[PDB]
Design an enzyme around this catalytic site. Structure first.
Site, PDB file in Angstrom:
ATOM      1  N   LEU A  41       0.819  -1.201   0.000  1.00  0.00           N
ATOM      2  CA  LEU A  41       0.000   0.000   0.000  1.00  0.00           C
ATOM      3  C   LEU A  41       0.858   1.258   0.000  1.00  0.00           C
ATOM      4  O   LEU A  41       2.065   1.231   0.248  1.00  0.00           O
ATOM      5  CB  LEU A  41      -0.957   0.002   1.193  1.00  0.00           C
ATOM      6  CG  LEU A  41      -2.030  -1.072   1.049  1.00  0.00           C
ATOM      7  CD1 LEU A  41      -2.922  -1.114   2.262  1.00  0.00           C
ATOM      8  CD2 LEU A  41      -2.838  -0.817  -0.201  1.00  0.00           C
ATOM      9  N   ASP A  42       0.204   2.369  -0.307  1.00  0.00           N
ATOM     10  CA  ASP A  42       0.813   3.686  -0.325  1.00  0.00           C
ATOM     11  C   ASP A  42       0.771   4.284   1.080  1.00  0.00           C
ATOM     12  O   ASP A  42       0.040   3.822   1.957  1.00  0.00           O
ATOM     13  CB  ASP A  42       0.071   4.583  -1.326  1.00  0.00           C
ATOM     14  CG  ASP A  42       0.835   5.851  -1.684  1.00  0.00           C
ATOM     15  OD1 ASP A  42       1.956   6.041  -1.176  1.00  0.00           O
ATOM     16  OD2 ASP A  42       0.300   6.667  -2.460  1.00  0.00           O
TER      17      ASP A  42
END
Ligand SMILES: CCCCCCCCCCCCCCCCCC(=O)OC[C@H](COP(=O)([O-])OCC(O)COP(=O)([O-])OC[C@@H](COC(=O)CCCCCCCCCCCCCCCCC)OC(=O)CCCCCCCCCCCCCCCCC)OC(=O)CCCCCCCCCCCCCCCCC
Ligand SMILES: CCCCCCCCCCCCCCCCCC(=O)OC[C@H](COP(=O)([O-])OCC[N+](C)(C)C)OC(=O)CCCCCCCCCCCCCCCCC
Ligand SMILES: CCCCCCCCCCCCCCCCCC(=O)OC[C@H](COP(=O)(O)OCCN)OC(=O)CCCCCCCCCCCCCCCCC
Ligand SMILES: CCCCCCCCCCCCCCCCCC(=O)OC[C@H](COP(=O)(O)OCCN)OC(=O)CCCCCCCCCCCCCCCCC
Ligand SMILES: *C(=O)CCCCCCCCCCCCC
Lengths: 87, 49, 122, 155, 177, 171, 79, 76, 128, 558, 65, 62
Positions: A41-42
């Protein structure tokens, strides 16, 4: 009123939120799944996850702690710190 | 207990009851209730001009 | 409420001002005008302890209503017709006030058309 | 406490300024005093007049209610900039724009009440009529004198 | 700006904090949940348009006028959580948070009302006082010359020792006494 | 009780109970319950206390001050006589104050007892109040905190000079 | 001591306003990742909430019924 | 179950002060109230009367309540 | 474009809209690191005394003692009578005294003139 | 006679008896809140008998029972005035307080200082019934300052919180600015009329009474949160919910209005005082209702509601209709206490959530709370033949048909529409729609304390206007003749407010994001009035309190 | 047995609170319709408001000169 | 001991306050002043026995 929080309850609710998230598959999600490195994920997604924790439990995590919570176990441990569980 | 039962501290109650005499003396005899002069104006000598 | 627009946006010369009126005599236009009869005696409304705003020309209905209100305790809904009588006669008193106002407005119209007729004629 | 941690006179030389900034426990570049006009501030640091409401609340404070630390040189008006008192915090609307909107709103409402007091609204009725010579004895008239007749007529 | 560990905010932290404050003030603007969720994905798209910007000066300027955008579009009374600072229930129970040392000032007739509690509190205090000099001599050999650079403290290194400066963090009052 | 002349009460006029509706009011039942449960035991205890008052009857007296010479016929700087004059004047000052208080109690009780017709029916008490306040003001106003019989005599003399000059300028 | 949480496989956003939101996001190439988290607000017992004119008119049916009952009772009592 | 200990300061000394305050007030409060009640019931309130011919009253005989008569006689 | 926020005495500029917060230069790194160093050193010097069990009392704060000594003691010995101090001690020192003096003297002369001319309604005024 | 005065004093002594109980304690209590609630229930029952025997004959009296002081012409006695105002206010205040304490036995159950809370709330009730029964200005000043200080102590209940102490000191500040005018009125009446008693004030009946009435209007400004001295009543929502319910909605904040209703024979012969009251009341009922349109804390919205109703009370005093204003006080107590109780029931159910933007879906979750909140809102707006109809509509039926400031009437009507707007705003964001609160539902209301406490004020909010307005005697003449567009004014304006706010609420479901307008920024930051003056007037004090006062003059020059 | 806290779903309701809420809503609309059926003038109007222009000059005394 | 509340808190204070008002307050002048009751045409006076005559006959309007 005001029901007691448990690490089983905090764990099951945090994982229940993350299993309703369309970038985390519910089969690879563990209690130690790192957001950037293991779930891919970011940091934007990580901020959305900590804001979802704020939406879930009804309080605010500050940004100096929101920038470091990088697994569901850190989330459960932080809510355990800020809620005094297992008295 | 001492202060509550002080014997008419500075004669207030007497002064009411005395007033209850004097009003009754001068309602009945048709007098005004209080004169505008504290002393008798006959026994006073004013400076002439 | 249209007379507010008639007095403010129009002229206040023809509209009767609220503070000091009647400006016309009571017999002016009325042949043998009679007075307003007071039904309740001055001593009767003195003993009934009525408010000085409430001792108008129809306080006798109010005296009957308050006697009914005292006598019907605790049945506080038993004297609706006496309140209706008092409210209806207060309504008629307000109608008489409206009639005085319309009289004053029409006599000011008479004065306005009189001076306009005098300016047209002479 | 002893003397060489207490305030002194106005720093003139730069080495006295350095000794004071070491004494007041802050950087020499940030350390500025109040200007020596003779108003008696002395060598106290002119902090930039920030209210304690503005501070970081989530920061681990030594004094959490004051939002203040140990050994930190306090503001001169620290009793004034507590969170029970004077705030300097940023607002969503500008300061002069707030003053303009408030003054225009208050003065315009005052002017409109003055306009409505100039032009009052009423009912198309005559005056309220009372019997017994405009209720002469009720309104405190003396019983020996007799007023003018106040007679009202039917309509 | 003002932080315990870092002396500043990194540009990555500034971007994440501005994104979070923008979403919070947006949720204040955009009360309903589906409506906020629609505008939240729209705003996520607006933030991910220039996620891959290499130039840090250009990203600095873009962040600056993004702060101007956020200040121009902010809600006047944003939703503050009740126990968040600025909330309605914030620091409400601080009048009930008695410090622990006040238990030392109790009379022995009410100390005897809870025998197991104070009988355990004695060995809690015993643990603290035989941990103190070891953690002081731990901190005096690890701290650099001139004092510590950052406010963060080292952990317990040896087995049997306790982490330094621990008693007020462990024995702090509960948030709902 | 008290004296009904200095504290006048006009004769009470209550109306008769005129029950018009068939529903029984609570007030008669509560009045009978108050008469039984409250008035009777209090009255019995008061009768016991009054019997004990009768078992030792002893009296007190209203102190009288015979009139000593006033400040006008006392010599200047003769403290033995003008002390007596000052004590007499101060006793009369406090008694005049209580006379004003009696007239105020009359006016307030008249206003409440007459209710809404207080302006019509309390003209005599208001007139007595205006006269006694004019008298008390002419007698004791503007003396100061260090008031004495000398200050009051000098105010009386200045008022008498003003009244004599007003009488002279009218003729 | 255990609060047994329900299933995370039953919170599907079809038939919801999240369906409309995902359609309008995918109309310009966007995808909604927190919709199933929001899905419990719009389904179940919280689905089909009344409007304001329906919140006002709570009890108006039985109230008008008992009203007509009392008007009929006084009309058949007055004669 | 899971009863939690509430840390609070010592309420022993404040309650001890208030118990001692009420005790040392009531210690002569209750005899004084009972004695004043017995005086007002049995000894009772004196009656106003005209000064007789030739009888000069004492200075304490110008007051109504018995405790006021006692104070004006004994101390004043 | 957008309305620029106007700072004030009682409305400070935010941290986000200040330009000098966005400094990246190494001298700002040095200043921020020295501020973090002084703050960390003072934090450590505090909480070694704060967490000490052998201390039972008040951790005395010499900044607080220095603040109170500045607010009380340092007022007179750093005074210099000049134009600014004398004019500001004459404005707020003998200004409003003269103001209320002439206001109250004017109103009392007016009231005395109305009383000695029989004008003031002193009818029921017997308490004073 | 012997029943009336006896039970009158028995009510007040009975209210003071649990204060002696809590002060003479050694044990831990066998439910002292139940003891105080039982005591106040029985004090209500006790005060019902003098009210019924006042409605029977009109029996008013004075109990000047204890002589306290005589300053040379001023006999200050302990004097209780039992008139129409006391006989209608005391049962309403005791009934509302009894419901508030049965509410508080549920709401304030987690507080370990519950006995101190019920003690302080009883002390407030004692000081308030000292206020509304006082016959001289001095005993009224006793009750006045008493409700001010108990307001301080019940705002700052969570005394560790900085904002609660700040709001409490703010309320003390604005109330003492009102006390400047109250002491001005006492000074004027003592110098020019030689009295503080109401009877001698009313019997002397002065004509140059502009200055004491300006003092009384400043006192009612400080006390009833009128414009200029208003923001402490929204600030005072930082205290607990039964505090804001009892004190700062229905009981304390009507005391400036009660002070002006108490002095009605002076206001009815002073047109200037009536005009100033009309202008100030119309300004307040405009401003606070406009600020209520754009708020999100429910306690703030209902506090702006009660301050707008106080402004409307000031309006209907200002048209020389004091008895309608006092009927509106007795009416307003029921539904506004009930609205605060239902809002706090939502707050305690939703785990201290007060912001309406995280509520919703509570029509079927909290059914009794939803029912009573709708009934309280409809009584507030002027639904036909609820309790709020029997006074407020009559207010409009005398505000139209009188010699009135026209702009004050128009702002009164704009306020009447705004009441409907924020009422359906509360029902929209808090009851309607879909949920917005967090995920762990602890929603519950099934305590007989909460249900019965809202139930008795619900019976009040349904029937009490009808019962009281058919039990009170006429003191004015009701103006009952007007055209049909003028009779249908308040209902049509209220329904227009409902329609406009329903259109506003249905513009929020749309997927559009607009920039904030200047009207929204004005009304959301409270007319910019607590933002400027709470910063500027302390600043210009405290620097002047340090630079020139302490340092320059009183340490160096002098 | 109390109302159990629930998660992401509709909370447990008692029969008694629902029938009481419906009962007081019916009480509100009953009392509104009842006093609207009996009074009907406090909302609409008690007496006719007459037209001033519809009054004749003889009862008001306007001699035309 | 089921209704000791109405005895200790009500009935004994009603006794105390009735004794106070009956033998100490009303025995002093003007302490309890009462508004005289409202007299209507048609009433019967209890202190006298005098019947108040009615009003004038009404010029009826309806
Ligand atoms: C009580 C003990 C409590 C505990 C002990 C500790 C107390 C504290 C310690 C104090 C120490 C002393 C301090 C100095 C004070 C000294 C006393 C003094 O100066 O007294 C002054 C003053 C003057 O009395 P006095 O000069 O001695 O006598 C006057 C008479 O001229 C002459 O008197 P009299 O002859 O006319 O009266 C004689 C009186 C005796 O005299 C006294 O009682 C006076 C002494 C009492 C003083 C008490 C002061 C202590 C504080 C009291 C207040 C707080 C108490 C605690 C809290 C209570 C709840 C709040 O006789 C009686 O009481 C008997 C009658 C009883 C009636 C009730 C029962 C009747 C029915 C019975 C049925 C059963 C039997 C049937 C069969 C019978 C067969 C035969 O006395 C009082 O004030 C007495 C107290 C009661 C006053 C009235 C109370 C109600 C008023 C209500 C309206 C006003 C308030 C409105 C408030 C509104 C809300 C805010
Ligand atoms: C449980 C408690 C109750 C007591 C139980 C045991 C006793 C049984 C009951 C019977 C009691 C005894 C008989 C009745 C009492 C005596 C009656 C009597 O004549 O007493 C003499 C007097 C009556 O006054 P007075 O008019 O006779 O004399 C006043 C004194 N001079 C003239 C010198 C000024 O005193 C009392 O009655 C005292 C009791 C007063 C009650 C109220 C007290 C309030 C205190 C407030 C302080 C601040 C005031 C500020 C406000 C002022 C106004 C604005
Ligand atoms: C009918 C006639 C009507 C007439 C209207 C015109 C006259 C009145 C004019 C207005 C006067 C009152 C307004 C100005 C003072 C208000 C001060 C105040 O309330 O301060 C509140 C402030 C905290 O407020 P807030 O920002 O909301 O806090 C929550 C989050 N911080 O709290 C603080 O900052 C704490 C400050 C403590 C010290 C206060 C110093 C200022 C004292 C002001 C005294 C004013 C005296 C006025 C006397 C008038 C005499 C005629
Ligand atoms: C009191 C009488 C109430 C009924 C008469 C007024 C009816 C009316 O005009 O209602 C306006 C409006 C309904 O119309 P609208 O919402 O635009 O259309 C959707 C319909 N459900 O809106 C409503 O009906 C809701 C507001 C009703 C207000 C009732 C309290 C006054
Ligand atoms: C003339 O218009 C007389 C009526 C009173 C003054 C005007 C009031 C106007 C506002 C009230 C009616 C509003 C109808 C929607």
């Amino acid at each position: 009123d005001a029901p007691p929080l448990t690490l089983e309850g905090i764990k099951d609710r945090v994982l229940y939120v993350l299993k309703l998230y369309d970038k985390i598959d519910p089969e690879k999600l563990s209690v130690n799944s790192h957001f950037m490195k293991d779930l891919g994920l970011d940091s934007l997604d990580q901020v959305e996850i900590i804001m979802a924790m704020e939406d879930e439990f009804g309080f605010e995590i500050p940004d100096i702690d929101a920038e470091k919570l990088m697994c569901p176990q850190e989330i459960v441990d932080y809510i355990a710190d800020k809620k005094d569980v297992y008295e | 207990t001492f202060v509550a039962y002080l014997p008419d501290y500075r004669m207030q109650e007497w002064a009411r009851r005395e007033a209850e005499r004097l009003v009754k003396y001068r309602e009945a005899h048709g007098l005004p209730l209080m004169e505008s002069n504290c002393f008798d104006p006959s026994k006073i000598q004013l400076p002439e001009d | 409420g249209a007379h507010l627009a008639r007095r403010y946006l129009g002229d206040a010369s023809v509209e009767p001002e609220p503070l000091r009126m009647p400006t016309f005599p009571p017999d002016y236009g009325f042949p043998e005008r009679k007075e307003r009869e007071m039904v309740a005696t001055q001593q009767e409304m003195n003993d009934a302890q009525l408010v000085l705003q409430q001792r108008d020309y129809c306080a006798h209905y109010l005296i009957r209503f308050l006697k009914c209100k005292r006598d019907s305790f605790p049945n506080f809904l038993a004297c609706k017709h006496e309140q209706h009588d008092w409210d209806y006669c207060e309504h008629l008193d307000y109608v008489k006030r409206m009639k005085e106002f319309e009289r004053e407005r029409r006599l000011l119209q008479r004065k306005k058309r009189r001076e306009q007729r005098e300016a047209d004629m002479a | 406490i002893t003397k060489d941690m207490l305030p002194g006179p106005y720093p003139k030389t730069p080495e006295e300024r350095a000794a004071a900034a070491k004494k007041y426990n802050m950087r020499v570049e940030d350390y500025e005093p109040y200007p020596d006009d003779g108003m008696g501030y002395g060598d106290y640091p002119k902090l930039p007049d920030r209210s304690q409401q503005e501070r970081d609340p989530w920061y681990d404070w030594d004094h959490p209610d004051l939002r203040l630390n140990w050994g930190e040189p306090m503001h001169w008006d620290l009793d004034m900039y507590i969170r029970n008192r004077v705030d300097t915090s940023p607002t969503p609307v500008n300061w002069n724009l707030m003053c303009k909107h408030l003054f225009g709103f208050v003065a315009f409402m005052l002017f409109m009440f003055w306009v409505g007091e100039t032009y009052p609204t009423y009912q198309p009725v005559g005056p309220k009529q009372y019997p017994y010579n405009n209720l002469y004895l009720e309104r405190g008239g003396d019983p020996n004198k007799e007023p003018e007749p106040v007679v009202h007529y039917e309509i | 700006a003002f932080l315990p560990s870092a002396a500043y905010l990194t540009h990555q932290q500034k971007v994440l904090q501005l994104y979070k404050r923008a979403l919070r003030h947006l949720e204040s603007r955009c009360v309903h949940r589906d409506k906020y969720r629609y505008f939240a994905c729209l705003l996520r798209a607006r933030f991910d348009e220039h996620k891959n910007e290499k130039d840090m000066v250009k990203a600095t300027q873009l962040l600056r006028e993004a702060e101007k955008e956020f200040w121009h579009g902010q809600h006047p009374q944003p939703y503050i959580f009740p126990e968040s600072p600025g909330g309605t229930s914030y620091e409400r129970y601080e009048c009930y948070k008695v410090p622990e040392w006040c238990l030392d000032d109790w009379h022995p007739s009410e100390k005897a009302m809870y025998p197991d509690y104070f009988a355990k509190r004695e060995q809690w205090k015993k643990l603290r006082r035989e941990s103190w000099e070891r953690e002081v001599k731990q901190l005096q050999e690890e701290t650099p010359v001139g004092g510590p650079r950052t406010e963060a403290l080292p952990p317990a290194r040896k087995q049997g020792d306790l982490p330094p400066l621990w008693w007020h963090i462990v024995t702090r009052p509960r948030e709902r006494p | 009780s008290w004296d009904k002349d200095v504290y006048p009460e006009p004769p009470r006029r209550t109306p008769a109970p005129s029950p018009q509706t068939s529903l029984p009011n609570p007030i008669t039942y509560l009045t009978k319950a108050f008469d039984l449960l409250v008035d009777r035991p209090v009255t019995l205890v008061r009768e016991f206390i009054e019997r004990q008052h009768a078992k030792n009857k002893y009296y007190y007296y209203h102190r009288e001050f015979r009139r000593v010479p006033d400040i006008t016929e006392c010599h200047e700087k003769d403290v033995l006589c003008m002390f007596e004059a000052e004590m007499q004047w101060k006793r009369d000052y406090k008694v005049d104050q209580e006379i004003v208080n009696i007239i105020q109690e009359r006016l307030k009780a008249c206003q409440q007892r007459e209710g809404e017709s207080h302006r019509q029916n309390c003209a005599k008490e208001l007139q007595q109040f205006t006269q006694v306040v004019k008298a008390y003001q002419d007698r004791y106003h503007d003396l100061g905190a260090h008031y004495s019989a000398r200050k009051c005599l000098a105010k009386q003399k200045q008022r008498m000079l003003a009244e004599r000059k007003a009488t002279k300028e009218a003729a | 001591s255990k609060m047994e949480l329900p299933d995370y496989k039953q919170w599907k956003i079809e038939g919801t306003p999240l369906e409309t939101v995902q359609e309008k996001l995918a109309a310009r190439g966007l995808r909604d990742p927190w919709g199933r988290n929001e899905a419990w607000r719009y389904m179940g017992g919280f689905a089909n909430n009344v409007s304001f004119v329906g919140a006002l008119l709570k009890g108006f049916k039985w109230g008008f019924a008992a009203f007509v009952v009392a008007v009929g009772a006084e009309y058949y009592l007055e004669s | 179950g899971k009863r939690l200990f509430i840390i609070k300061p010592s309420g022993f000394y404040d309650k001890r002060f208030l118990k001692l305050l009420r005790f040392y007030i009531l210690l002569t409060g209750i005899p004084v109230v009972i004695g004043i009640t017995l005086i007002n019931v049995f000894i009772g309130e004196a009656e106003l009367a005209e000064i007789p011919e030739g009888y000069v009253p004492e200075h304490w005989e110008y007051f109504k309540h018995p405790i006021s008569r006692w104070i004006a006689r004994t101390f004043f | 474009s957008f309305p620029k926020y106007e700072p004030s005495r009682l409305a400070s500029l935010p941290t986000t809209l200040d330009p000098a917060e966005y400094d990246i230069s190494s001298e700002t790194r040095k200043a921020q690191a020295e501020r973090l160093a002084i703050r960390s050193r003072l934090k450590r010097e505090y909480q070694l005394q704060y967490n000490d069990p052998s201390r039972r009392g008040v951790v005395e704060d010499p900044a607080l003692i220095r603040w109170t000594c500045a607010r009380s003691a340092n007022v007179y010995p750093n005074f210099r009578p000049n134009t600014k101090t004398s004019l500001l001690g004459a404005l707020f020192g003998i200004g409003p005294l003269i103001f209320w003096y002439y206001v109250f003297k004017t109103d009392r002369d007016r009231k005395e003139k109305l009383i000695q001319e029989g004008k003031l309604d002193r009818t029921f005024n017997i308490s004073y | 006679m012997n029943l009336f005065s006896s039970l009158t004093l028995v009510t007040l002594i009975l209210l003071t008896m649990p204060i002696a109980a809590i002060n003479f304690n050694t044990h831990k209590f066998t439910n002292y809140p139940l003891y105080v609630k039982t005591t106040i229930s029985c004090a209500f029952i006790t005060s019902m008998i003098p009210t019924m025997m006042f409605i029977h004959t009109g029996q008013e009296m004075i109990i000047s029972n204890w002589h306290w002081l005589t300053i040379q012409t001023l006999k200050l006695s302990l004097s209780f005035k039992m008139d129409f105002f006391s006989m209608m206010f005391v049962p309403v205040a005791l009934f509302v307080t009894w419901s508030i304490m049965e509410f508080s036995m549920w709401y304030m159950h987690s507080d370990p200082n519950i006995n101190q809370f019920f003690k302080y709330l009883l002390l407030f009730l004692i000081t308030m019934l000292i206020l509304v029964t006082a016959n001289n200005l001095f005993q009224l000043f006793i009750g006045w300052e008493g409700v001010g200080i108990m307001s301080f102590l019940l705002i700052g209940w969570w005394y560790g919180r900085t904002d609660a102490n700040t709001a409490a000191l703010q309320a003390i500040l604005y109330n003492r600015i009102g006390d400047i005018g109250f002491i001005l009125a006492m000074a004027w009446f003592l110098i020019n009329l030689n009295t503080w008693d109401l009877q001698q004030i009313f019997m002397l009946n002065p004509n140059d009474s502009n200055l004491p009435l300006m003092g009384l209007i400043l006192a009612a400004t400080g006390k009833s949160a009128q414009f200029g001295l208003h923001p402490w009543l929204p600030s005072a929502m930082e205290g607990p919910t039964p505090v804001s319910a009892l004190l700062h909605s229905s009981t304390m904040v009507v005391a400036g209005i009660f002070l002006l209703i108490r002095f009605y024979p002076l206001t009815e012969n002073n047109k200037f005082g009536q005009s100033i009251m009309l202008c100030l009341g119309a300004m307040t009922t405009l401003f606070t209702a406009m600020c209520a349109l754009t708020q999100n804390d429910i306690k703030k919205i209902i506090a702006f509601s009660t301050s707008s109703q106080l402004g409307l009370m000031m309006v209907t005093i200002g048209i020389n209709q004091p008895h309608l204003a006092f009927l509106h006080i007795c009416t307003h107590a029921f539904f506004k206490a009930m609205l605060f109780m239902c809002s706090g029931s939502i707050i305690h159910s939703l785990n201290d959530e007060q912001d309406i933007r995280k509520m919703g879906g509570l029509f079927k979750a909290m059914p009794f709370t939803t029912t009573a909140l709708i009934i309280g809102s409809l009584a507030l707006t002027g639904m036909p033949f609820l309790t709020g109809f029997y006074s407020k509509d009559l207010i409009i039926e005398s505000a139209n048909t009188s010699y009135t400031n026209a702009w004050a009437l128009l702002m009164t009507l704009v306020a009447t529409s705004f009441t409907a707007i924020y009422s359906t705003r509360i029902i929209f964001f808090a009851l309607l729609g879909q949920p917005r609160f967090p995920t762990l539902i602890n929603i519950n209301e099934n305590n007989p304390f909460l249900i019965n406490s809202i139930k008795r004020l619900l019976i009040g909010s349904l029937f009490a206007g009808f019962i009281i307005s058919n039990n009170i005697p006429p003191m004015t003449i009701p103006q009952m003749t007007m055209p049909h567009y003028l009779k249908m004014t308040a209902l049509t304006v209220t329904i227009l407010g409902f329609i406009l706010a329903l259109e506003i609420s249905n513009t929020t479901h749309y997927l559009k994001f607009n920039y904030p307008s200047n009207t929204f920024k004005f009304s959301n930051l409270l007319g910019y009035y607590p933002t400027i003056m709470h910063r500027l007037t302390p600043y210009m004090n405290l620097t002047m309190s340090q630079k020139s006062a302490s340092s320059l003059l009183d340490l160096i020059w002098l | 047995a109390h109302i159990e806290p629930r998660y992401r779903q509709f909370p447990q309701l008692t029969r008694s609170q629902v029938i009481q809420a419906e009962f007081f809503s019916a009480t509100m609309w009953f009392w509104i319709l009842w006093r609207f059926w009996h009074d009907s003038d406090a909302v609409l109007g008690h007496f006719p408001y007459p037209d001033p222009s519809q009054w004749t000059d003889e009862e008001l005394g306007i001699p035309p000169d | 001991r089921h209704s000791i509340f109405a005895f200790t808190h009500v009935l004994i204070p009603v006794w105390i306050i009735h004794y106070y008002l009956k033998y100490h307050v009303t025995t002093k002048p003007y302490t309890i002043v009462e508004k005289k009751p409202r007299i209507f045409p048609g009433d019967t006076i209890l202190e006298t026995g005098e019947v108040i005559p009615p009003m004038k006959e009404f010029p009826d309007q309806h």
